[PDB]
């Protein structure tokens, strides 16, 4: 069967790639082609013949779409099922098609981008040469010019997972804060009605403010508008979880809170809001 | 009492009207309990906060926050120190025309 199933890997789609996904259960065992040479497989590789096509598929997609796009999606999902790592050579040629399809916007491309962001974010190995371009493309397309809300929600998910880990330090504070501020700026401007991704971003910033405070305290300076917006949001649970952290940061004394709200708090970032109700919140919670 | 204040605040959240009034009616109550040492500094630093520079986006807000804040401040018993220039500025920019004239 190793000689035959390879034919299906040639992207004879006819909606059979979903059936090729069935072979993922087999790859969950070892998939030893990445951690070592390809010759470490024992009479089930002829994963050499499959990795070969998975690598060569970049040809048509980079030399120029939905067909080859879904083919790449499924083949990289199957190959990256068990072993999350893969050689940099294929990334360097595949991530070009990402931007090429991104700038082509002028339906399945959304799912392709979702899968690609899922597969690429597992490991970061570039020496800040192309990774810069990766983060720039992210912040300029998935946040600024993303037409669909699902891809924005997915990038919010990936950056949440990035800020969530604590062990190993794959992300860095600079690009993290850049992504966070670009989100704060655009996510609420271009998607005000879709409260789902807004609540997700607000939960992300609430976690950033709540957990890992001993490590990060400079990032809070730029994200003041995000915190204020989450405090004045129309959702009661988000407002409550934001006020519970806004209150504990100050002494439970009426004079201290009054001085704070009168000289240390800047309401400019609020924006045409009746912020005095937050003053009522703060003055009545200390009772 | 904790069950009353939480629901009171959650009710003031949704209604901008009848919540401005709560601040107008509660702030002077707070001023009453503040000692002279606290009241002096608070009144001396409120004017910088009445200006507060870029806190002007409320210029087009119907119930501008500065309106409610200066109303509450004026409704206190001892609030002597307030500059007339800032009063006229608030009256012109914000919807404080007649209140500012009465104070002046």
């Amino acid at each position: 069967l190793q000689r035959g199933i390879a034919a299906c890997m040639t992207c004879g789609n006819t909606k059979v790639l979903r059936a090729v996904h069935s072979l993922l259960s087999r790859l969950m065992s070892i998939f030893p082609t990445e951690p070592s040479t390809s010759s470490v497989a024992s009479k089930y590789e002829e994963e050499c013949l499959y990795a070969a096509v998975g690598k060569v598929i970049y040809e048509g997609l980079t030399n120029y779409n939905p067909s080859q796009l879904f083919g790449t999606l499924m083949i990289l999902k199957s190959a990256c099922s068990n072993n999350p790592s893969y050689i940099d050579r294929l990334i360097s040629v595949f991530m070009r098609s990402l931007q090429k399809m991104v700038r082509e916007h002028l339906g399945t491309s959304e799912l392709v981008m979702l899968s690609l962001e899922l597969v690429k974010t597992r490991l970061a190995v570039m020496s800040m040469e192309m990774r810069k371009n990766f983060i720039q493309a992210i912040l300029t397309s998935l946040i600024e010019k993303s037409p669909d809300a699902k891809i924005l929600r997915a990038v919010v998910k990936i950056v949440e997972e990035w800020v969530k880990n604590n062990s190993n330090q794959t992300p860095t504070l600079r690009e993290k804060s850049i992504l966070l501020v670009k989100m704060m700026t655009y996510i609420e401007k271009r998607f005000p009605e879709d409260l789902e991704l807004n609540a997700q971003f607000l939960d992300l910033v609430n976690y950033v403010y709540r957990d890992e405070t001993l490590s990060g305290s400079e990032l809070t300076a730029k994200l003041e508008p995000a915190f204020l917006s989450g405090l004045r949001c129309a959702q009661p649970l988000i407002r409550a979880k934001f006020f519970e952290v806004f209150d504990n940061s100050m002494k439970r004394r009426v004079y201290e809170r009054l001085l704070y709200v009168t000289c240390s708090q800047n309401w400019e970032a609020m924006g045409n809001h009746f912020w005095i109700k937050q003053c009522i919140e703060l003055l009545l919670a200390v009772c | 009492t904790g069950a009353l204040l939480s629901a009171f605040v959650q009710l003031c959240h949704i209604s901008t009207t009848l919540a401005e009034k709560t601040w107008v009616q509660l702030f002077p109550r707070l001023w009453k309990i503040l000692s002279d040492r606290q009241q002096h500094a608070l009144a001396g630093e409120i004017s910088p906060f009445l200006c507060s520079g870029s806190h002007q986006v409320q210029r087009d807000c119907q119930p501008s926050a500065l309106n409610c804040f200066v109303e509450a401040m004026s409704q206190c018993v001892p609030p002597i120190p307030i500059r007339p220039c800032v009063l006229k500025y608030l009256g012109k920019t914000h919807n404080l025309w007649f209140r500012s004239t009465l104070m002046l």
Binding site: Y209, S217, E218, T220, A221, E224, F227, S249, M250, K251, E256, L259, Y260, C263, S264, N266 | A41, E45
Partner: peptide, 16 residues
């Protein structure tokens, strides 16, 4: 810049 933070509870000028 000093270890400042707009979210912190820095309340200056209590008697100045």
């Amino acid at each position: 810049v000093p270890p400042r933070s707009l979210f912190d509870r820095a309340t200056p000028g209590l008697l100045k």
